[PDB]
Design a protein around this ligand. Structure first.
Ligand SMILES: Nc1ncnc2c1ncn2[C@@H]1O[C@H](COP(=O)(O)OP(=O)(O)OP(O)(O)=S)[C@@H](O)[C@H]1O
Ligand SMILES: Nc1ncnc2c1ncn2[C@@H]1O[C@H](COP(=O)(O)OP(=O)(O)OP(O)(O)=S)[C@@H](O)[C@H]1O
Ligand SMILES: Nc1ncnc2c1ncn2[C@@H]1O[C@H](COP(=O)(O)OP(=O)(O)O)[C@@H](O)[C@H]1O
Ligand SMILES: [Mg+2]
Ligand SMILES: [Mg+2]
Lengths: 228, 581, 15, 578
């Protein structure tokens, strides 16, 4: 029981109504987690299983972590929560050979146990780098354990696996496959319309919020900015 | 544990205001800070090297709790005195500490040494700490959104706290507490010095600031402590061999400069890392030689980098602006874009090549210029810091240095020994850097500062440094002139006409000690000899660079110091006139 | 680096 | 028979500043607390002893533990180690630490000594068991909550400082760090004199001068072992009937005297701790070639005296500051004499250049032995390509980095002619640019030795960018007085009768069974027939050719050592040198 096995306690003040500029990935994420829980009679009619894996990739501060946390607080209702596990590829014990496989197997055991689950790996290329790389510190057994533990074809259950990274190149090309990470979503630096939408999201709970013209000017003067 | 507050924490005034506006003022004025829906943090982590002031900031915040009750209740706990032999009293006591924190609404819990309370859970971990983490996480997720309890936690090893508490909704806003820089060490040394009976001049405190690159506030405190003890030792060496209390007046003990120079070697450097170049103002001995050339350089850098009117836009803390200066008083967007795009249009492409003869004081000029640009960010591209081999090739190290210069504008990219850099660093690395400077907007304050010895001007007009914009930006270090050389050697001749009853030295203690209570000759040196030796020093060092002037100075200072105790300095002047031949 | 640990503290807890 | 427990402070040689500092911090806060209040400072209550093995740390703790239990006021010594703290129950190690600190506060003038403190308090790691980080945390808390008057002093010896947690080594917890170095020659002299103090037939001062000259790299433990095996060699040759007898034969201990030959035999059979797995220290001039080189070497020791100010500044070597304050009076804002005193060192470079051979390995070793306070940094390829894959540049830059932080330092390049061909161009450029980035007053000697180097291409060339201008020595060949004094120890080997040799002579007279409980034929016209052609053969020879001739003639003279007629030895020498 002694490992990093705690669910990240999400707040219900994060949903898709607080995300700006990423509506296609939200609509693709509804059919991945929310609609198989809500309409299990329809996925069984074609005997299809939804994709249990998705890689969020993009520059820092574009909302990959926010998208995962909103996914957790989206279908956590009707006394049916989504248990959120969040790990990171920058942990001191993540490259700890012998221990890191035990922690990963215990994480996937506890994610199978709390059945509608989300595992979010914040820097997956820290955990699963390319095995054909040119640094000496590379653990191939950790990556093979991560390969075989996640399975969108072997029916583990309603466990969604999400990985976040800056570019999908540094991640192992064994993990970008229909069983492991079916989909990859690019989270870009937001454009002028999406920056207007984010700055409208960040000020809508003010006392006297900014005017529309003021927000449009702010969106223009923030070229090269992420939502963070 | 004393009545310690701020105005004792030098070099971290900005962090306290950043913490006060982050922690203390949202807890104190929710009528103000809930108007904008910005949520106060659930967990704020102070991390840094040891001795950097992290327990001082919480003790000063708890003296900012020395205020009236029901506001900013402060709880002072450690990574110990919570954990116990029993199986429940640790987690029950943590739940109770959080319940008393909720009971007084606006409250702060501080965990000094949080790696003691929350270590990394693994399979060499104990059960009782793992359960302490398992309850502290659930208590932090239980804390409500209307943030009225803030948990501050301090560590000197941040990747030894458990990873779970660093996740969103937990300890997520961080404060790094670095080792102090030179002005911060100056302020710290002033703070330690403050309440002494006999005072310390500000020039010596500045010299002691420039000698301690690597010293935290604890190190500077103990440096002052050992300086005081060395001074008590030299003023009364009889209280040490007594075995009984002697009547000593503590007023005649004054901590001098020699005591601080002895305490500097009596203090362990404590990861000083005195490596490479150090920004340091021009030394007092060669300051006659390179003062006007450095002044021309400083004026050229003021015109180039617009330092006359910004000095980082007259801002190092915004709070002191908002009380002393009255502001100017949406049709203001066009005005602000116009006057901002005209204020940034002053800076085109900053490039300074300081060329000189061989050995003309370039290692001094470069360090004094980098002392002049303290508000900048220095990315040194010299060979010793690129081949320092951090498991990366030197192309990668050059590229990451330029990235850090580009992130932290205003910044300099400082290449000393440019003619050696050209032959040593591979040609494709210089072309990578030239492409990195071509892919730069003309509104970015990244000065490319290069110091060279005898660099052929053909190589910057049509060679490999031609795609660096060094067109009109070559400063030539001149060889120093007759006024500079004359004022340089006037200190040497002032050392000559200095009597052996005025030169400090160490002769034997021929007089007895006071054994405390138990409870008229002229230096024979004519002015014609002084005038002749001045004329010979000027005539010998003709068209000398700074290094070969320092050589003549070192040789003649050796000669003068050899006949230090002589009262008839004729065999000194004969040695000196004979040497300069 | 992978090496194991002592069988955990007995927690006598009787006195 | 065993080691002491009543050692006083005069049995410790070479560490007088640390003895005075320990006496200060155990006595001065007790008598004069107003001086610690007049200045707003807290007396240091923590010392970390650190240094190489066998250098004095447990000895000084033992001497302080004996000093705690003698005087009219009593300081209580509390001795601990990792065994009597570590427990197998939850919360019992930290409880034992707290009982130690509370019991030391109860007996309030107190010392607490943690020996091998890196084993008790290692660097905190998440890849270790939690008991070690828990012990470090409990120790940090107990030190941060001590009496705050100088009552409980905490002394720790780690042998390795890096292993201990950096939170304990910051001021506040362990304020002072006493570095116990390997002793230099005055300290080794004083230590050997302490060892040879209760000996009945004493040692001289000139012999202990020679004995401290030859034992560089020895700790105090190695010098004590040198006296022990010298004494046991003396017992062995004085009375060898002890070692084949199963019951006690009576000997007379007054008939045993430790001879110079016994010490010289014990020097061969002893490796110091500092060389027991590594390369041995740079040695002085070996005794045979001191005629050929020493005067020339003495010229070097003058040229390195008027360029580094050796004897003027280093007259106080780890000595007591207190005895300097008692023995010398201060004159008592005017520290520009510091600036002129720093101005005597301009950039110190030396290129000792000579012919091929000529004893430059001996001269380099002699100079690096002469500069024992300096931190030598060896840029020979035996160390630069030693730890491989590191890269020569990361080794050369690191070597310059330890040469500019632990000043005074020497950057030492032997075989400079081989070095500027077998060293990559970038290293010389990186080293040349690293040297011209220094200030002029910074004491980093660039010592370079070269055999037959091109002096035209050191003005120009690769070494143009170093200031080898007027500080370039010249090791010319030995002179006729020196060659004659060299070969005049070889003629002394010709003038030994076979009854003068200390060689293995058989025993006809057996052991004295203790009480149980001719003429040498050497004509004096041959004895200069050898020497005149011996000098005539060695015309403009270097040191290597001279000692090769010495080696051949010494073989010839040594093979006919059993004979009294040495005419057949002379004519073979004259035939060889021809
Ligand atoms: N900026 C500063 N100004 C003045 N004194 C300082 C400063 N920083 C540190 N000090 C002194 O150094 C002492 C130690 O500072 P602390 O705040 O206890 O260090 P720390 O950050 O807690 O280090 P660790 O991690 O606990 S070992 C303080 O008690 C002060 O006396
Ligand atoms: N400076 C010294 N003066 C006199 N004797 C010394 C000196 N240093 C060492 N010795 C002798 O060497 C013996 C062993 O030295 P110790 O000081 O016990 O070793 P140590 O310094 O504790 O080093 P380690 O790390 O424990 S091996 C002492 O008991 C002395 O007899
Ligand atoms: N595209 C976005 N839309 C709305 N808010 C955003 C966006 N990107 C970032 N943010 C805000 O910034 C915060 C941090 O961004 P984060 O998700 O950590 O970036 P990343 O996933 O790249 O690490 C989020 O909690 C969110 O409030
Ligand atoms: Mg602290
Ligand atoms: Mg010991």
């Amino acid at each position: 029981e002694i490992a990093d096995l705690d669910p990240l306690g999400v707040d219900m003040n994060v949903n898709f109504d607080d995300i700006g500029g990423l509506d296609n990935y939200i609509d693709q994420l509804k059919e991945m987690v929310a609609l198989p829980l809500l309409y299990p009679e329809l996925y069984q009619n074609f005997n299809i299983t939804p994709p249990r894996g998705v890689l969020f990739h993009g520059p820092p501060g574009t909302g990959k972590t926010l998208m995962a946390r909103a996914l957790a607080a989206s279908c956590s209702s009707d006394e049916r929560k989504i248990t959120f596990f969040m790990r990171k590829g920058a942990d001191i014990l993540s490259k700890w050979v012998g221990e890191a496989e035990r922690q990963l197997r215990l994480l996937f055991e506890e994610a199978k146990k709390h059945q509608p689950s989300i595992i979010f790996f914040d820097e997956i290329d820290g955990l699963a780098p390319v095995r054909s790389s040119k640094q000496e510190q590379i653990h191939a057994s950790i990556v093979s354990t991560l390969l075989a533990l996640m399975d969108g074809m072997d029916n583990r259950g309603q466990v969604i696996v999400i990985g976040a990274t800056n570019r999908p190149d540094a991640v192992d090309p064994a993990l970008r496959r229909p069983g492991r990470f079916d989909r990859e979503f690019y989270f870009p630096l937001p454009d002028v319309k999406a920056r207007f939408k984010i700055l409208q999201i960040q000020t809508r709970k003010w006392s006297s919020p900014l005017s529309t013209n003021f927000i449009d000017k702010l969106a223009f003067l923030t070229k090269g900015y992420g939502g963070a | 544990d004393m009545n310690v507050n701020f105005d004792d924490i030098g070099g971290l005034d900005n962090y306290i205001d950043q913490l006060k506006e982050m922690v203390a003022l949202p807890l104190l004025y929710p009528e103000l800070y809930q108007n904008f829906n910005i949520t106060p943090p659930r967990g704020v982590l102070f991390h840094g090297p040891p001795g950097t002031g992290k327990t001082l900031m919480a003790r000063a915040l708890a003296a900012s709790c020395s205020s009236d009750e029901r506001k900013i209740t402060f709880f002072m706990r450690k990574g110990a005195d919570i954990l116990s032999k029993w199986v429940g009293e640790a987690e029950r006591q943590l739940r109770l500490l959080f319940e008393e924190a909720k009971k007084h609404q606006p409250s702060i819990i501080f965990f000094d040494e949080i790696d003691g309370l929350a270590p990394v859970r693994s399979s060499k971990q104990e059960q009782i700490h793992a359960s302490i983490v398992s309850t502290l996480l659930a208590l932090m997720d239980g804390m409500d959104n209307r943030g009225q309890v803030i948990v501050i936690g301090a560590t000197n090893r941040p990747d030894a706290v458990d990873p779970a508490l660093r996740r969103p909704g937990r300890f997520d806003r961080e404060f790094y507490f670095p080792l102090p820089d030179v002005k911060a060490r100056f302020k710290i040394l002033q703070i330690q010095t403050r309440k002494w009976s006999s005072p310390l001049s500000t020039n010596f405190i500045d010299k002691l600031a420039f000698l301690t690159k690597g010293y935290g506030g604890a190190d500077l405190r103990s440096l002052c402590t050992e300086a005081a003890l060395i001074s008590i030792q030299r003023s009364f060496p009889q209280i040490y061999r007594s075995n009984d209390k002697l009547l000593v007046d503590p007023s005649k003990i004054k901590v001098k400069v020699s005591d601080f120079m002895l305490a500097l070697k009596k203090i362990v450097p404590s990861s000083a890392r005195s490596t490479g170049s150090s920004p340091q103002p021009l030394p007092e001995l060669i300051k006659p030689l390179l003062a006007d050339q450095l002044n021309n350089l400083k004026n050229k850098l003021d015109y180039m980098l617009n330092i006359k009117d910004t000095t980082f836009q007259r801002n190092t803390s915004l709070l002191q602006n908002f009380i002393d200066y009255e502001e100017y008083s949406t049709s203001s967007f066009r005005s602000y874009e116009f006057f901002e795009s005209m204020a940034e249009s002053q800076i085109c492409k900053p490039r300074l090549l300081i060329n000189g003869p061989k050995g003309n004081g370039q290692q001094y000029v470069g360090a004094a210029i980098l002392n002049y640009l303290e508000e900048f960010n220095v990315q040194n591209l010299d060979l010793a810091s690129l081949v320092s081999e951090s498991s990366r090739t030197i192309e990668a190290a050059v590229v990451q240095s330029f990235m850090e210069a580009k992130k932290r504008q205003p910044s300099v990219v400082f290449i000393p020994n440019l003619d050696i850099w050209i032959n040593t660093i591979p040609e494709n690395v210089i072309l990578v850097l030239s492409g990195l400077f071509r892919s730069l907007q003309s509104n970015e304050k990244i000065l490319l500062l290069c110091l060279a010895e005898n660099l052929d001007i053909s190589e910057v007009k049509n060679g490999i440094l031609s795609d660096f914009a060094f067109d009109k930006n070559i400063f030539q270090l001149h060889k120093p002139s007759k006024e500079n050389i004359t004022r340089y050697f006037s200190n040497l001749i002032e050392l000559l006409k200095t009597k052996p009853s005025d030169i400090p030295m160490k002769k034997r203690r021929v007089k007895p000690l006071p054994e405390l209570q138990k409870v008229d000759k002229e230096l024979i040196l004519t002015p014609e000899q002084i005038k002749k030796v001045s004329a010979c020093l000027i005539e010998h060092c003709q068209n000398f660079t700074v290094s070969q002037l320092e050589d003549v100075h070192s040789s003649v200072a050796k000669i003068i110091w050899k006949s230090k105790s002589a009262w008839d300095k004729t065999g000194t002047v004969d040695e000196i006139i004979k040497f300069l031949s | 680096k992978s090496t194991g640990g002592k069988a955990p503290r007995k927690q006598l807890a009787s006195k």
